[model samples]
Each structure stands twice: as structure tokens, then as C-alpha cells.
Target chain A: NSTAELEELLMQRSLTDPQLQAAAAAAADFRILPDATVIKIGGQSVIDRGRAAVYPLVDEIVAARKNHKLLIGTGAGTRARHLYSIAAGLGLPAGVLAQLGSSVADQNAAMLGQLLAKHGIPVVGGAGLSAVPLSLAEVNAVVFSGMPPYKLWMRPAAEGVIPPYRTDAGCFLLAEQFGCKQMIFVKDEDGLYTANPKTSKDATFIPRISVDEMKAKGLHDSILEFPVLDLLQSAQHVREVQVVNGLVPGNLTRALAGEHVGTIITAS
Target chain B: NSTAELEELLMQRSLTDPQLQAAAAAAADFRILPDATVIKIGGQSVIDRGRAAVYPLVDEIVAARKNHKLLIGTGAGTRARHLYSIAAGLGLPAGVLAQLGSSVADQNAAMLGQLLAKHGIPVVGGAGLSAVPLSLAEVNAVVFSGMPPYKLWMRPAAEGVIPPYRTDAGCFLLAEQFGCKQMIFVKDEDGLYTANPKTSKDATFIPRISVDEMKAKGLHDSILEFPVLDLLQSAQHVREVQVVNGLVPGNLTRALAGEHVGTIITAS
Candidate 1:
């Protein structure tokens, strides 16, 4: 809990280069600990004003009475810049923002590192990027990205070094391997939909979906955001992976506790 | 090491969105190449969490060695949460939990990117928030902190940024710079008191503190935590600087090493 005195000092932010310093100060004040915690924070949207979103997430994790490790995945920094700059510098890849979306994730990681540090938790590199799950001492909670498994994509770039990572694909693998009582996926929307909510006015959020029925309707394709892994593979190892809108705070707590907060993907 | 048998089947939560077929099948298994060798960790209190403490630190750092560069610092996470939070966020203010307890020294470096990510060395940002000092690349270790001469502080923060950072003012200032040879502090504990242990009754930790000490002192008023800058302004450039127990963990190690483990003040 932050005292009025600490909060007032933090909000001052009058010092030059206060971005880092101020954040560090705020972290000292926002001390909350959780019981069982694991955080999977992404970087794709960090460039937007959503940088503030992390503060809320941090607050939540801290309140959980547990120590949390933040593994930030890179979102489009040097890699994307390298790709687009070559073209711009030489005038080649024009209007390739969509193509560069993946690279944006890396850049996001760098920025997120600074932000997380400000909040007082160590922000090491994320899955498919750096070796994580580091120093899990007194740390039952962890957070990384939701990117599909791309350890292979990153490993070759780094000369065959696969860091212990937390990937959506890895999550799928772990859920089944560890015999997870339940697996959950918090998405951008309220929940999974029977139709493309973006395109169809009649679209409705699905409360649950059976693996057999999902296969029959070819719903498996929409399981993961990255193309690195497919639905069928994810289902085999996971007892179930549910999809729920992540924006709702405490949604994760609910999902993990086996509450009906999102759409469950179970073997039919 | 993830086995193929551990891989899971994917199940989708959405039905309408068009899913990719080729990408999912190609996702790699949760296997990591064994290139990691060294493990750098920080956060000293983490050391107390029994076996649960050591493995995570070793694993993350080993992974970093396998994949990228590695450097580490310490802050006793969970143990020094309040003290570190105050030091890191509030700029060396008094903390509620510790009052005069040990401050997490690495909190400063972890907060600033200047030391976390250096040239050629992948500074492990906040992995081990508290621990000992050891480096394979260097032989001479001079660690100092406090209101260091501008030259000392500016140079290291801008130099090859390694541990054992030397300074003149406060330990927190070291967070802003790097390349430490020794840390120094001038505090209220009067060069290691012969008695009056906070928790112990007739405990005399050290009489004339050292591993060694540079000078001698007597009991006085408790030092102001924020006056670290004042100490830096008074000290001269030396092989090391140390302030004894301006706060807890401020002991002979800091004094001998020339690191600001405590309030290291010098005469104007």
C-alpha cells in the first residue's frame, strides 16, 4: 500500500530522466504479494498508450500475495527495423506494416523491460528470446507472452540456444504434460465466438466448445494467434484450454479456479 | 527438456475465423538446446528460500549463458521488498518494513538500464536481486558507491559497466553508473558496534570492522538515508569506499569491498 506521501512524491515526476527513476519509486510503493502467480504479458500493443496497462497488471499481480516473474517477449524492435529500414534506406519494402507486425513484438519487449523495471519486478527476456524462469525463488507467479511457439525461429538466429521459455505452444504442451487440472487462454475479446464477431453482426460469444464438435465445425484453426502450432496439437496435451477476454481483471484467477468465466475447449 | 510424447493437441475456441493449416503443424516441440553454462543471479534473500531458491537463479542464468551474454546483481526479493521498494522508487528514503534494516543494493542498478544492459555484456537486469560478488573476466575488484565524484560515477555508468562499481556518495547512485571497484559508506553504527544487536542481546558482530576498514568511528546519531549524496561529495577517489551499516547488511563486506553497503560519509 502506498502512503499519500509516497504517492505524492512519485507523481511529482519533475526530475529529468524521471521515466525510469519515477517508475522505480512507484514500484517501491506498489508492494503487493500474491499466493500462486504466473503472468503471461505480451508486447504487441505496448507501443500504443497501453503502456499504462502494465501498471494495472502489476498492481494485480502484487496483490496476489505471491512473487511474480515477468518474462517480456520482444515485439518489433531491431528485427522489424532491420527489415523495413533496408527497404526504406534503399526504397524496397513499401507499406509493409502488416508484414512487420511480428517484429513489433520484440521492440515491445525492450520497452516493456524498462517499464517492468520501473515497477520493481525484474523483466528478463521472454520465451523464444531469452532463458527465463530464472531464479524462481519464492516466486510461484510468472508472466510472459502469448505468442505461439517460435523457439525454433529464434534458436537458429541465436545459434541453437533455446532458453527455457513460456510460449502459448509451450503452455499447450505443459498443460497436458503436467496434467494441468485446467488450461486457460485469455484473449482480446469477451470470449470465443461461433462466428467472426468482427465480420458478422449475428456473431455470438461461445460459452464452451467440445473438441469433437469444434473439429466437426473446423473451429480448431482459430485456437492460436501465431501459426507456429495448430489446435489439434494443443488439444492432445491439454486437458482443456479455455478462451476468455483478458481485459477483465481477475479473469485469470477465475479461470484457474475452474470458474465459468470463458469458453472451454475440451476433448469431446 | 520437452518430450514429443508431452506435446498436446490443439483445440480452438472460435469457429468462424479462418485458421491457417500449414503453420500449426510445423510448431516445434518444447525442446531446448543445451548451450547454457554460467548462471548469474541476484536478490540475496532469495538465497534463503531453501533449494527452491538456488535452482531458478541457476537455470535462468545458465540459460542466458547458453543463449546470450550474462551479468548479475542482487536485491533480497520478498525479504527486502519494502526496503528495496523504497530505495528503488523513493530515492533512498526510509522504508516501513526495515526502518534500519538491510537495503537491497542492486535495486538501483536493476532500475536503471544504464547498468542492466551494457556493451557486450547482457546484464542480467534483476535476476538475483541479492547475492555475493564474483566475476571471471576481472581480477582487481574495487567496489565503491555514494555521492561519488562526477568523474567516477559518470565514467563507469558510461564505461564497460561491470560489477564492483566504485562511487563516492550513495549505493543508489551506483544504480546510475557502473564499473565498480569498491563501495563506501559513513553511517550511524560507528564502525561496527561491539554490542547492541537489534535482534540479539549481547551480540558483538565485529569490533574494528574490516574483511577490513579504512578508518575508525564511534556511536552517533543515525544517518539520514537520503544524505547519500552528501557523503559522495566529501570522499576522494580511492581504491574503494564503504559506509558501514548506514542500514542493515551494511557490514565488513561492504567496507572492505568499498561498496556503499551503508551511510558512508566523508568530512568536507
Candidate 2:
């Protein structure tokens, strides 16, 4: 099928044929579950930290369930990085890296389910936002894998092989699809800061920033995935993202209650 | 990032952790575009044949638009195979093969857009079914890539690296999400057969079959993709699929009109 003559033509048109813009835009899309909130627990930042970290978030999730309709998503922390190291070393492509990444997040969610279920909260299985409501009706909370289903369609990077659309990007797309009231990211830190915060002696936390402003700063070592910043800039319903320290007690609960306990990234 | 010691356990749970059954099911989902009939034009079966093959389908699409809501999906055809051959030779993974697969379908759809635009039919751009309605409201027909957003997540096959979830699978998921009345796959042949009719002397034409029975027979070289049959079994909205010969000018119109012009594969 790879006729040498056709390769040049295919290469020329690969990027331009379909224009990169939505054909239609409205003042707003119909809200499926406007009251729902999407909360993503960090894979390594929280889950891998053990019961000391995960147990408190479970408590917050259980308490929040009584008042707020929550959809739980899990991140792929250390396990994902391990998989990527092997795959990348094996000379696999970005899409395969993503495949391995999603699997780890799924594992985290499943393990998280066990703790939630033991607490008398039923965990429902669903892949994306399209199938979550059925879980919400009778279940205490719904848990889904946080990675977007960008499996094989993820484009190769200009410089590296890592798929750019990771958990944060998936969570944003998931939250926007339902027009969720808020998209909360549960991390181990207070919020976005001047540095990793864990190591930097002079690191200072920035409580709020605009997506455009974040891009202008050109900061690399940030708390959230880089793709998420880009997605926040273009999202429709998910205008703001709240990052709370899941390591702190009642932080998730406070954030769920609309208290700004973490960093808030705005679309504007 | 992959831990060598964890590969065995990761492999085991990968198959088991998320049981195939969906967490939730409903008698019916709210129809976003109930009137929409997802008509997927064949990339290799039709479009790769030249303008004479492509124009008639466009005419039928324009004619159908007046009486029905239509969402169009395109296939990968020869261009896709070319990409696959090169990528596979380059030692890419299944996810990368899928990434290449989707790009070709995007190309075919883009070219189809140009042909449609020339006919005064305003072409609308959207990728997955999620972003389609915006195009549907103002445009005559909404064209989307038939490949599902499975990018980096595509799994390696038990047998090979070729991605199993191709355009037909994507179309099935798209139609099911929308709860469309019907899904049509346009091919050059009449319908499913005992063998590839073009090459087999005694290939018998089968106008109707059930998903279960089709699986029982274990047929390969079928008109539609293999993954489609599996998806049709688990789908919520898409209960059946109709495949008709695009070479015959009136088959598409008749299929759209609810006549059995080709093969109708049922879910029940």
C-alpha cells in the first residue's frame, strides 16, 4: 500500500486537510448533569502514598457523597512512569505509552474502589462521562479511570514520544462533556507553586492564575500536566480547575464545599 | 517507567480488573440526534475508486439530507494500509498503527468534504461524536472521522500489533452514543457472504444474520471490521447494522428509506 510515489503527497496534506476548529459553537451546550463534580485523585501524588494518604481522601469522598454528586477519577503515578520507561526504552510509540498509562490509572481506581466499598459505598465501573449517570443514581460515588481514551490516535511528539494528553486532559474533557459545576484535581500539594515545593527551599505557592498567563510564564516544572493547561484554555463548560492537597485532611471536603483550599486555574 | 518485576501481574490484571460488562445500562438513553442516520462511506471500498465512485454517494447524501438527519463517517482504505505497512515495518506498536489508521480516514473525509462543499453543501468539521451536534445544526451533513479516539491506549493484539478497533467499531460506538435509529456501512458488495465474493466462486449472499450466529460461524474476510461484531453485542443504542453496495446507485437511498437493499446484521 505504501507506494513511494504517494508518500510525498500524503506527507504534504497530513496536517492541513481537516481544519483544526469546531464547525459550530453555541452560547452553551445542554447540561447533562450540571450539579456533578469531577474529582481526580493523583496516581502517585496521592494513591501511591498508601493508606495514610488514600484513607483521608476516601473519608472526604464519602462525606462529600451525601451532599455533592461526585465522579472520582484516578491518576497513574509511579506505576505509569515505570511502564513508560520500559516501553520508551523498548522503542514503542507515544500511543502505546498512553495505553500503559491508562492501565495504571485503572488499577489505582480499582484499588481505590476496594477501600470505598469496604466503607459501605458502592463503586461503579464506567470508562468515560457518557456512562457515569447510571452509577450515580444508586451508588455512593462513581469511580472511573482518569486518562482520556486517546489510545492510538495520539500523535507523535515533535521532540519526544510521551503522549501529551494525559489524565488531567482526560478529566477536563470528561468534566466539560457533562457541563460539571467544577473540575477538582486532588493532589498532595496545596496548589500550583513557584516550583515542585517538595525540594525548592524558596518555593512559594500561587493560589490563582489565568491559563493565558500560565502559558506566557513558560513554566515547565508545575504541579499539573502541561496538556491540561492547554485544554483549560480551550474548554467550553470547564472554565476553572481546582487543585487541592489530598494529603491534608478535609481539603477535598472543603474544596467540595466551594472553599478555595487549593490553586484555581481559570479559563479567562 | 515499567517495572520489570510487575509485568506479569500487570498482564494478568489487565485482562480481569475492569470486567467487560458496563457498570450501568438503561432501557434507552436520551437521543441527541435520533433522526440522525450515521452513514459511513467506505474509504477503500468506495472513495479510493476515484470520483465516479465518490460522486454518487455525495448525491445520495445531499438528497437524504432533505428528509433525514445525517452524520457521516469515513474509512481508511488504501491510504491507511500504506501508512500501516510503513509503520509496522518501522516497528511501531498497535496504538501507533491505529494513529496512522485514523489519519488516513481523516484524509479521505477531508477530500469528501471538498466534493460536498462544491455542491453547495456546507461541510462541517468535527472529530468524534461528542463534537458533532454543533456541525449538525447549521450544516447539511456532519462529517467525522470514523476512528474512535483510542489513540495511545490501543492494546497489542493476542496475535499481532494491528489494531482491532477500526472505523466500523468507531461508527458503532458513535451511533450507540447518539441512540441513532440505524447505522449504515457503504461497501462495494451487496452484503455479508460465505466468502469474499470477488475471489470465491460459490460465495453465497446472506441478507440477514444475528450477531451471535455470525460469531458462531467464525467468518473472516467479512465486509465490516471484526471488532464491530463484538461492539454490536455490547452496545446500548446501536442494535443493528446495515451494509449495502455503494456501486449500486439506489442501494444507499433504499437503505436510508428503510428498505433492506443489503445485509442487515441484528443485535438480537
Candidate 3:
């Protein structure tokens, strides 16, 4: 707020600084909601499968919430992409396209929230997930919009019209903000592999690896969005990103219980 | 939340539809805090001027808030651009540049909030401006970050490295969300002009104009961000954008009073 602070910005800064934006090292690492584990469910892969797919996952969450304080963020699947395609074709601005994209995630958020609410779960409205108060005393689990708040203000794409940051990055940053105990992605896939299992029988299951190693190995399949890896490299409090199969009956539960149920990418 | 709604999304949608996101006309325009006026104070233009430039404007806001329920949002001025220059150099992604961009706005937001706080203004914590409860009696004026929530999840820009959406769009959308009676921009300029008045004395000041007419007449200056005009074209509830001279003391008060002391851009 002061020119004195403005004076500091004059020196230099980089996101690669690895410490609070690599500027103002004096600023301490202040993280909130560390006790909570962020669980993200994919839209196209899992949620779009309809009631049978979502019902089991909701049941798992119902059981998991009691043992661990969970914060849930949902992704928008084919639907979001559909909206984006239409928006881009219509020659909409990048920010407007992103605004339309998030509304899709909002639909999934509400769907999962309603399913959870059926089991007596409290779904915090997605005004600002930042405003949702999650404490052991008051609430054990929360569900809201998974997309980061980059709506009408979306940046232009690095290349084409599709937004660089989508539901995966949205959910990833939420965990980073809270410095959550664990960040989990629940998808139909059982684990990260040498290749897409659906397309390749030669693929091997890679259970765990560091983020740098993943990039170094060139395992850049579209399983997780690319931006999550880049953000993970620079992340502070949130050290690991986990992806589990929602199709499997017990994988999410094990992930929540801190058991190695699926793929884990470490920050180091 | 229903497949039926998802089916409806399958039917048709467009940002140009003149409804909520130009889709599903049955959706009602439910706005909150209609009584509160959204006042965006410029970051680089006003805040970067430091004490003298900012003090008189603060004095006026202090006067206006007594009769008006004001909501304030701040812009990050030269400092935001400086950070973006560094970030773009590092080859950061579009979203990262935006996240960095909003932080600059946050700094100005804090500066203005503190100034207002000194004058006994209640600054609501900026988690989600959506979370802010602006009522008739409990609070008079509030200040918080002006940028829309689009941070790390920023959409790719339509063109270059600079983010398409910034502080202007951020503040404009906040008013749209509330369906506010008026949306005001407190800036260094007295009004829009046919040309840059600083360089051209031949230019005439424009007092009011429609959004499309502004585009048709080709007044694309650095005065306001370009995307604001594009978004304003399809706006639903927020019908106008008013920019007044913050340096001229009483201009902000008159804009708040709906007296039209500056340039007005219509949504139609």
C-alpha cells in the first residue's frame, strides 16, 4: 500500500523465484485450510457417464467426509468444450468464452452438491470458494465450483482459442491456495501409465514419480492438463498431486485415507 | 443440475442472446445489492500518482458514502505493467501473467481500502466480491480488489502476451452482477474525446455515446481497455459505463448522484 512497498517491486521478480512469487522473500508462507484434502472429479470422463457413475462416487465421498475433512471441486467435461467451441466459432472474446466455460463447471458443481446434499452434506454455494469457511467444528466437507474465478477476464490463449487454464488447473490451484493435506483427482483412469491403457496394452502402470521426472520422461498425455504440471513445479505449500479412479469402488477412499491408491506426482 | 437442463444447453446458446449469457431466456435476472454503487478507482492512473492525486478523490468518496451505499474496486497502474513485462520475459503462461496482473490490482485495492478505512469506511475482505453483503443499514461504503476473479485460470488472450481482461473489465462486471443502477469509473480523464486531447486541441469531448456507435465511430484509444467495449455490447443488466475526472474533486460525487458529469457509454 505504500511507496516503500512499490519501491521493492522496482528491484526485480520472477514466478520461478520459488518463494512467494520469488519476490519479497521477507513475506512468510501463510497457508489456510491445511487440514482439508482437495478432491477433484472430472466432468467429461466421470460425471458425464450419468447416475451410475456419479452415485458410487458420491457414496464414497459420504463415507470419506467423516474420516477426513474434504473439499470437493468438479470439472466440466464434453459440455464445457462444447460451449467453448460454440463461443470461439461465434467470435467471442477470450474472457467471454471462459465465462461460458465456467458455467458448465457450475452445473457439475450443483449436480454433485445436490447428490451429496441428499446424504445430509452441506454444499457451500460457489460465490467464492475463498469465502467458504471449512472447519472441523462447523463443517467437515464442502463442494463448490471447481473452475478458478477467471470468468469474463480470461487471458488470451497461448495459441488457439481454447483456454489454457480449465477445470484441472482450477481444481489444482484450489489445493495450492489452501496448502491442503493432499490434492486428489478422481477420474475413470486407475493410474498414470507409460501410455493410455485404452489405446496401448504395452503401457506400464506408473504409481508415483516427482513432477520434474514426469516432464523429463515426456509422459505428456492429456490425462491431466499441462498447466497443472507447470504450476506444480512452482507450488509452495501443496506438495503433491494425486489422481485416482472414481470407477474403482475404493480408490478415492484409499487416497483420502493417505494410502497409495493411485498415481502421485510429488512437488520435489 | 438436471439432464433436462443439460439437454436445454444442447438446444441453443449464445453470448449475443441478450439474456443470462444469451442462453435459456427463462432464467431470471436476479441481482443482489442493487442499491450499492460500484466505484472503480484507477490503479496506475490514480493510485500511482501517490498521495496528492488520491487524497482529494478519497475526500469525495468519504462525502459520497454518507448518502450512497458504495462498493469500491481498485486498479493496479504502472506497477502491474512492470510485473507483466518481467513475467512475459520469463515465458510464463497466459494464466500466470494474469495471476501476477491481479496482484498489482490487489496492491492498489489495499491502498484505496486503507485510505477509505482511515475515513471510517468498512472494507469487506476481498475473497469474493460476491461474498460481500452490501445492505442499506449495516454498512455505508466498502472497498476491495477491483479485478474479476480471473487469476491463474485466465483464458488465453486473443492476441499477444498481455491479458485481454484487466481492471476495467473486472470493475465493469461487478456492476453487471449486481444489476446496479449505475456503473462509474473514477479516472484522470474528464471525458471521452474524438482524439487524444493531450496531443490534439482539434479534438472535441464526447459526453455520451452508445456502445456500438462508439465502435462505429472508431474511438479506440488507450482510454479504456478494448474488451470492456466488447463485453458491454452484450451486457444484460448493467446498461451504462460512466467515466469521470477523479482529479477534479466533485466529479465522482456527481457521477454517484446520477447527474452525468462525464462521458457515458451505453450497453445498447
The model with the greatest TM-score is 3
DockQ by candidate, in order = 0.02, 0.03, 0.02
Q: What TM-score should be assigned to candidate 1?
A: 0.40
- The reply for model 2, stretches above 4 Å from the true place, is A1-23, A118-140, B1-268
| lDDT value, candidate 1, whole model | 0.37
Instruction: Name the top DockQ candidate.
Output: 2
lDDT of each: 0.37, 0.76, 0.75
Model 1 lDDT tens row, B1-268:
2223222222342333233233343554221111111111233323334345444433333333332322233333344555445454654422222332223333433332232233223323222121111221211111211222332223222322221222122343443232233333323344444434554577554432322132333332222222333333433322223334322332433344333343333333
Least well predicted 10-residue stretch by lDDT in candidate 3 chain B: B130-139
**Per-candidate TM vs. native?**
0.40, 0.47, 0.49
Which candidate order results from sorting by lDDT in descending order?
2, 3, 1
Candidate order by decreasing TM-score = 3, 2, 1
Give per-residue lDDT, candidate 2, residue A157.
Answer: 64
Interface Cα root-mean-square deviation for all models: 11.9, 16.0, 10.6
lDDT of 3 by residue, B114-148 (tens): 45532445445542243433442323667777766
